[PDB]
Amino acid sequence: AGIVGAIAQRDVAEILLEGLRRLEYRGYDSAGLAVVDAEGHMTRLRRLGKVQMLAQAAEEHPLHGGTGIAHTRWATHGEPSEVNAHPHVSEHIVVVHNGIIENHEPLREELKARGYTFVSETDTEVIAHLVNWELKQGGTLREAVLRAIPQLRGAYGTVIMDSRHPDTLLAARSGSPLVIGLGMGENFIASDQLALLPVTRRFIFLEEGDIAEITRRSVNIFDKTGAEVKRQDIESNLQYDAGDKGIYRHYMQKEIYEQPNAIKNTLTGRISHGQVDLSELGPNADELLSKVEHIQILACGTSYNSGMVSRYWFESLAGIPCDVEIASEFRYRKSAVRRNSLMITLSQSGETADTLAGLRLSKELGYLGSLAICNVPGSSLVRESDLALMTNAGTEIGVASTKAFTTQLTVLLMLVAKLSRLKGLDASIEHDIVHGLQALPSRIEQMLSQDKRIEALAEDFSDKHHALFLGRGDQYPIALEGALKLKEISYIHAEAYAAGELKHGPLALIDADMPVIVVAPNNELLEKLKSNIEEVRARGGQLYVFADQDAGFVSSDNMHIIEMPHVEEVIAPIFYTVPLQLLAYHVALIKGTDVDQPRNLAKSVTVE
Amino acid sequence: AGIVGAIAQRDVAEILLEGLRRLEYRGYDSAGLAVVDAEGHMTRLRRLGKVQMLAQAAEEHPLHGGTGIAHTRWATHGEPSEVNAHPHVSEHIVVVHNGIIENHEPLREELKARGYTFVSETDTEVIAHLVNWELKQGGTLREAVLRAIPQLRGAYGTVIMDSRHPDTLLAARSGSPLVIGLGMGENFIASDQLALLPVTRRFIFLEEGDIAEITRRSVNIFDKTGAEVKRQDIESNLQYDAGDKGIYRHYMQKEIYEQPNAIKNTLTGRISHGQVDLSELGPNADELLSKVEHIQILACGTSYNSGMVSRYWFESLAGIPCDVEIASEFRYRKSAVRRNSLMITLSQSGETADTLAGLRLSKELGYLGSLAICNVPGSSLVRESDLALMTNAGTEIGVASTKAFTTQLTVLLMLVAKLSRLKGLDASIEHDIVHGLQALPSRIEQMLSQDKRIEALAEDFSDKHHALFLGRGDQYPIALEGALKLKEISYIHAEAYAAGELKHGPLALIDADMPVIVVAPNNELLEKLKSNIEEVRARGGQLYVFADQDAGFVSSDNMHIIEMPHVEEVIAPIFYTVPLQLLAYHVALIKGTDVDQPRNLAKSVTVE
Amino acid sequence: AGIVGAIAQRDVAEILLEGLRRLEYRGYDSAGLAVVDAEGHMTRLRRLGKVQMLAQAAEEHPLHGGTGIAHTRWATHGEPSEVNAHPHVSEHIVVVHNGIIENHEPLREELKARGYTFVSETDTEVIAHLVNWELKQGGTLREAVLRAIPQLRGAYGTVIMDSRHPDTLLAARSGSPLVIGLGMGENFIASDQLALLPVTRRFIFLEEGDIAEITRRSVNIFDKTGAEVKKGIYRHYMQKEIYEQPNAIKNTLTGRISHGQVDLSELGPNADELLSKVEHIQILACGTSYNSGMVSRYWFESLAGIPCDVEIASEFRYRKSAVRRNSLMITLSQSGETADTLAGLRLSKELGYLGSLAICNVPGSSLVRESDLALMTNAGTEIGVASTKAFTTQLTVLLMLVAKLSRLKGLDASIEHDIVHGLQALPSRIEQMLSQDKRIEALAEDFSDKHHALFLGRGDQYPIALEGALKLKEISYIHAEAYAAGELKHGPLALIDADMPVIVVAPNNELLEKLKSNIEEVRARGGQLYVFADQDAGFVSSDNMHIIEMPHVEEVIAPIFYTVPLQLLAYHVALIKGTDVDQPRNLAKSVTVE
C-alpha cells in the first residue's frame, strides 16, 4: 500500500516512520521497516495494525543506520499478520512491494525446488528469493534485479536492498507509482510524494517500466534492457497546505486517482474469512434477503449505469432475475411488480428527485422492501429505505461521478454472493468474487499507471465532435458510462451502443469525425467489429480497442489496439471504467473545458 | 549580509555553504563558516572573496561535524579581510552577525580593560567577547546571551554557539531578520528563508526582540526578558476557500464581484482629511520620494497592463517622467538609467521570476531605490524592495487576475498625489484624485449591475475566433487588458491595438468574424472609428462601443453603442475594466471553458 | 469570593472595605480584613454575614495600619462562619484565598505532624501554615512562597502577608484572577479590576502562574520557576461601520466553519456536552442587542426546536421570575458593560440557571469576565453611538449557535447544512445589498420631512422592523414605531395618513395582499406603503404602494440581509437633515451607571 526508502549519512528510521505516517490515509492493515547500519547489521520490525504500533515497537530499539525501507500493507495474498508484513527477506535481500505478482505460484514452486523456504503466504516473498537466487549467480544488485524483473508477471512497485552493501537501493516500477526525492548528500524514494515532503521537494517520477539504482549521491534510471533512460528532476512548486484538492489540479482528477482507497473503504469490514460479510445489515437481514426472488433497480445517470452493470452479475453469477430502470420512467408508468421483489435504489447523493419519487411510489406497490446504495449518510434515500449500504467513497465534489460509480459497482458485486440462487453450483462463485474484490484496489492502481498512454490517446479525440462507444454484456454499461463522461466534461457528442447493434444503424454514421471505441471485446466480437470498420475505411473510420494484452490483438491502420494488463474477469467492468474516465479527463484538459463544473450540469437534481 | 546555521546529526558544512550560495544575491565581500564535531573540535574557515573560494578551500580540507554557523559579509566596521570576516571567536564562543552593534568602541574598551585581545576591526567581535564574559560567570549559553543582548544597541541579528557544548545554538533578532527552518531530528536558521529551501519548508519567523535556543530536537523562543513566547510555523499563505465563493459559481467571478470591497480595503488607512496618506511608508519616506525625478515600472502580464495605465496618470497629473516595461525585456538588455530613478515593481504574487530578476538587477544599476506594489505579504518582491504597498485585495484564486489589477490601479493612482512635480496645479489635482477614489467603490457597483446586459452581449462573441480591442490614452491599456482576458479564459484570439493605429494594418483583417471593440472613446475618436468601420462594411465589420450614456451616441446597424453609467474621468480606466472582465467571464460561461484554471496558464510564473 | 490587598503610607482599612463593597456582586456568606501598622502590630476582624455588618463592626474598633489584606467568602470547603472566614492567621503570616486547595487533605494532617494546630475547617488554612513552616528560615516572604505554590494543587489565587516585615505583600495566581493597581506611593491588588476603581485606574494583570511581590515603591511579577518578568473615505463612523459589515461578518465567521459544519470548539473541550443539557434558552439584553435576540428566538424555536424567551434586561432584573428547567442564560451586548444586562446576569447566578453565555464585541468586559462561556463577535470596535455591525455580527453568532443547540433529531443534519450554506453566503449577500445604497439614498427624500413612520414585519422580520424603527428614532429623530404586521388593523391603522408612511420588511405574497388591502382602507388620507421585497416575488408598484426591489437571499439569513437597507435609510435621512449621526442627541454608546 505504501512504500518509503532512504539512503543517507544520518539515521533514517524516524524519517521512514514519518513517511509511513504520511501515507496512512491509504488503507493498510500492517506496517514494517528495515534499516542497515554501515557494518551491515540489519534491524527489521513488523507489526499488525496501525503505524503507531510499529513506532512503539521501534521505541525500544536503537535503530541506527543510514539505509532502509518501509511499507504499509493492504493484504491481497495471505492474511494480515506480522508473518506476512513487509519488508520480506531472503537472508541479505530485503524487499518492499506494492501490487500483485500473479505468476506467484509457478515462481514459488520453482524457488522451493531450488532450496528456498517460504515462511509466508504472500506473493511478495518470491521476489525476495528470486533476486536472492539471481544474485547467487553473481553480478551487482542491479544486474540481479534486471535478470529478475522479466520473470515477474503483474503489478509491482518494488524497492530492494542488499544488507551486505547498504550504499545502494534498487527500485522497479510496473503498474504502481514510485518517486525519488533528492536531498543534500542523501536520497529518498516513496510510492507517494506526500511521504517525502518532510525532507525534500525535489522529485524524479519513475515512469512505467523504469528501474532505478539509488545511492546517497547518485541516481541512475534505465529500462528492462539496461539502457540508461533519462527523467527530469523538478522542484515541486506545489502548495500542499492550500486546500482540499491536495496535489491534484481538479476535484474530478483527485476523485479518479483516489479510487483504490475509496474502494478499500467500501471493502472495510465486509470480508471475513474469505467470504462477504454484510452483517452490518442487522441480525434478521438474511431473513428478508432469503425471501427475495427478484431484484428491481431504480436510478438516474451514472448510477443507472452501475445498476446496469450489476444486472449481468446478478443474473449470471447469482441466477436471480434482475431489472434495472431509469427512475423517471418508473415513476410515471403503471408497472407490474414481480413476486418477492427487492427494490434497490442507487444514488451518490441520496437526494435525486426522480429516484426518491421512485422509492416512495414503490412503498405502495407490494415490494418485499427497499435497499439503498448511497454515498451520503443521512440522505432521504438512506433514511426512507429498509436497509442501506453506504459506499464510503468520501465526499465527491466533481459534478461528474467517478469514485461514486466504481464504489457502487463494488457494493453491487458484494450483493451477488449474499443473494445467490444457483444452489449450487456455487461456493467457488463467492471465492472468485472475494478474490477479485481483494485485488480490486491495486488493479485500479494498475490502470491509473497507464495514464500517460491515455493522455497520448486523448489527442486523437481532442478535436472530434462525435464518438461511438461499443460494448457487449457486462462491458456494455461501461461503454454507456464512457460515452456519458465524454458528453459531460468535453461536450463531444459521444453515444454508446450494444456492440451487436452496430450494423443495424450507427454504421451509417461512421467516418473520420466519429471514432469508434470498443471496451474489452473477446476475439470473436473483435473480428466482427474489425469487419464492420472495414466496411467504412473509405470514409476514414477508426476503431480504438481497449483489450487484454494477453489476447495478442494486433493493430492495423484503422484498428488501434490499446493494450491493458490482465485482470480477474469478475471485476473486469470496474477495471475498464478507469481508462474511459481518464480519456474524458484528458480530452477536457486539452480543450480546456470546465472539468469540475461542466456547463448546464448539476451535482444532483433535487427540485422537480 | 547572510547568516546560516545548522544543528543536526549529519555533517552540516555542505548545507551551510549551499545556504550561503543561495544568499549571494545580497552582500557581500568576504565569507566564512565554523563547524564542530561531537568531541568539541571546532574547525573554522574564512576567505576574502566569493563563496566559491570558501567552498573551494572547504573541499580539499573537509569540515566534519553536525553543528555549525556560516556567514557572508558586507563590511561596515573594518576593511574587508579574512581577519575581519565572520565567524568571529572568543575562545570557545563563536559568532556570526548581520547589521551593526552601534555602541562598539565603548564596550570594546570596556572588555579590552578585562583581558580580551581584539584581533579584528569589526564591531562584531565585541559580541563574541561579551558572550564569553557573561558565560564566565556560570549558567549556560542561553542565560548568558539573555544578559548580553540588552548591552548592545543597534539594528542587528546574530547567531551564537559554544563549541564546548555543540548541542545548542542561540539566536537573537534585534533589527535584522532571522527565520528558523524545522527539519527531521535536525534544525536550521538563516537571515532569509531562501537559504533553507534545499533542506526544509517549515519556517518559524522570529519576531523583533526574540531570542531562540535551538537544538537538533527542540526549539525554544523567548524575548528580551527571557519569558518563553511561542511562535507558529507558517508555510503558505495562499489557502482556498471553498466556500468563500459564496453566491458565485467561480473563484474568478467572486473576485470580480468583490472588487468594490477589495478597493475599500486598499483605501483603508490611506485617506484622511481629503488627502492621500501614505505615511505607512516611513518617517523618512516622504524624503526619499522627494528626490525622485523619474519612474521606472517593471511587470509581467496583467500587472504590466496596470503599470501601462499608470504612466498616463503620472505624466499628465503629476508631471513626472514614467517608463513601463515588460520585465523579461528589462532583465535581458543593457539599459540607460535615468537620473534619480525610482524603481517600481507591480506583482500580484510577489514571486514572478522575471520581475524579481528585474528588481535585483535594478540594485546594481544605481536606482534611487525600489517600491513594490504587491498583493501577497512576505513575498520575495516585498522582502527585497526598499518600500512596499500591499493592495489588500485578499487572496486571489482564479488564474486570471481581476481584483488584483483594479487594486493595483488604485494604489498607483494614490502614488500620483504623493509624487507630484508639478506643484501649484495642483491641489485641484489631488482633490480630483481623492474625490474619484471615494467614488470608486460605488462606481464599480454600478458597473457590476450591468452584468445582465454584458451577459446578453457575450452571445455576439461566443462563436468568434478573432476580436480587435481598441483604446486611446489611459484606455489603451484597458483594451490591452480586455483583450488579454478574452485570450485567457475563452481562448479567443483577441488582440489590442492603439485606436489611432487601426488604419495602419488591422483594418485589412476586419470582417464578420472579427468584431471590433472600442473602450470609452470621445466623440472625435468615435467619428474616426465609425468612418473606419464604414470602409469595411462590405465584409460585415461590426464596431462595438462601450461609452458614457451621457455622450448621446446613437447605435446604427454596424455600430453598437453599449452605454454605461457616467464616471469621474480620473477613475474611468478602472471603471471600464469591469465590463471587459464580465464579457470574458460570460463568453467563457457560454463556451463552458475552465474559468478558474484556463488551459496552459499559471497563477504565478516562478521558475525559469 | 473576592480579595483586596493594600500597601501604603495611609490607613488602608477603609480602602480594603470599599474594595470589598465593590466585589459584593460575587455572592458571599462571610467577610473580613487584616491590617498591620508601623511596629508590631496586627489586627484582624472577621464576621459572618454581609460586608456591611463587617464595616459596622470595624467602625467600633477602627483598624490602624498601612499594610493589609481583605476577603469576601463563598464557603466551598468549611462551614460559613467567623472561625473560617479570611484572612487566616499563622502567628504572623496572614492569608486571604480565592478558590479551592484540592490537596488540602493529605497536606493538612501531614503538616499537623509538626505542631501546627489547625483551628478552622477550611482548606485555606493549609495555605497559612505551609508558608509559616517554610519561614523557619528560607530568605523571606517571596523565597518561602516560591517553594509553596508548587505543592498546592487546585484552581486558586492566594494573597499572603508577613507581620514582622510590614513593607511587603505576596500574591499568587494559580487558578483564579488577580489584578494589581498602581500606585502613587502605595499599591493595591484586587480579585477584580472593579474593586480598585475608587483608588486607582492603572492595572498590571497577573498571568496564570505568576508570583508577585508588592511594596510602596515596586511591583515585581516573578514566575513559579522563576525569575524577573515584566474614518478614511467615510463621513461618519456609523457610515464606515455600515460599509465594513462584510469584513466584519467575515471575521465573525473565521475559524467557525470546519468541514461543512459549525465549529464552536473554542468554547472548550467540555462545552458541547454542557450544551447538551440545555432545555430552554433565556436571552437578556438592551436596545439593539435586544432586537438581535428577538430575531434569534424564531430561529431557535423553528430551526433548533428548542424553547427560547427574550427579555428587556431592565424588565427581568426587577421582577420575581419563574426559571425554567435546565435553562441557559444568554446575554447580548456590544460593550459588555450595559448595567441592566450585567445586573440580569448577576441575578441569574443565584436563580439556578445551568449557566451563562455572553455574546459580546469587547474582550475583557464585565459581561465576558462574569459568564461561564463567551463568543466574541469580532466586529472590530464600533464608534457610532448607534450600533450597526455589532447588530449583524450578533445575528451571525446567534445563527451559528442554532445548529449547536439542535433538538430536532434526524432533521438536524440537513438544517445545519442550510445554515452553513447561508452563513457562507452572507458576506457576498451583504455586499449585494450595499450596492443598493444609491437607491436607498434617493428613497430617503420621501422620509426626510416626515415626523412619523410605521414599520411592519411578520415573523423573523418583525424584530428587523423593530431595529429599523429604532434606527430612524436614533439618528433622524423621527417618531418611527414598529408593529407586528398582523396587528396593524387593531389600532395603528387609525393613525395612517400622508405624514405617516408605512414600511414593510420582506413580506410574502399573502401578507402583502393583506397590507395592500389595509392601505387601500386609508387611501382617502394618502396612506403610503413602502415595501422592501424580493424581486423574484414579482410585486408591482401602484400609486400608494412602492415596491423597493431587492435581490433574492437564502431564507435563513434574510433578517440579516434586510437589516442593511434600513440602516442605510436611517443614515441617509439623517444625512439630509444634517443631524449628529455619530452622536445623536441624548443618547449614549453604553449605559453603564444607574
Ligand SMILES: O=C[C@H](O)[C@@H](O)[C@H](O)[C@H](O)COP(=O)(O)O
Ligand atoms: O401516448 C401516450 C399514452 O397516452 C401514454 O401516455 C399512456 O397511455 C399513459 O401515459 C398512461 O400510462 P400509465 O397507465 O402506465 O401511467
Ligand SMILES: O=C[C@H](O)[C@@H](O)[C@H](O)[C@H](O)COP(=O)(O)O
Ligand atoms: O540580434 C541580436 C543582437 O545580437 C542582440 O542580441 C544584442 O546584440 C545583444 O542581445 C546585446 O544586448 P544588450 O547589450 O542590450 O545586453
Ligand SMILES: O=C[C@H](O)[C@@H](O)[C@H](O)[C@H](O)COP(=O)(O)O
Ligand atoms: O403596581 C405595582 C406593583 O406593586 C408591582 O410593583 C408588583 O406588584 C410588585 O411590587 C413587584 O413584582 P415582583 O414580585 O416580581 O418583584
Ligand SMILES: O=P(O)(O)OC[C@H]1O[C@H](O)[C@H](O)[C@@H](O)[C@@H]1O
Ligand atoms: O447518483 P445520484 O446522486 O442519484 O445522481 C444521478 C446523476 O445526477 C447528476 O446528473 C450528476 O451530474 C451525475 O453525475 C449523477 O450520476
Ligand SMILES: O=P(O)(O)OC[C@H]1O[C@H](O)[C@H](O)[C@@H](O)[C@@H]1O
Ligand atoms: O502579477 P504577477 O503575480 O507578477 O503575475 C503576472 C501574470 O502572471 C501569470 O501569467 C498570471 O496568470 C497573470 O494573471 C498575471 O498577471
Ligand SMILES: O=P(O)(O)OC[C@H]1O[C@H](O)[C@H](O)[C@@H](O)[C@@H]1O
Ligand atoms: O449592546 P449594549 O453594549 O449592551 O448596549 C445596548 C444599547 O445601548 C445604547 O443605548 C446604545 O446606543 C445602543 O446602540 C445599544 O444597543
Ligand SMILES: N[C@@H](CCC(=O)O)C(=O)O
Ligand atoms: N500482494 C502483496 C502486496 C500488497 C500491497 O500492495 O500492499 C501482499 O499481499 O502482501
Ligand SMILES: N[C@@H](CCC(=O)O)C(=O)O
Ligand atoms: N558590521 C559587521 C556586519 C556586517 C554585515 O552585516 O554583513 C561587519 O562589518 O563585520
Ligand SMILES: N[C@@H](CCC(=O)O)C(=O)O
Ligand atoms: N474552599 C475555600 C474557598 C474560599 C473562597 O473561595 O471563598 C473556602 O471555603 O474557604
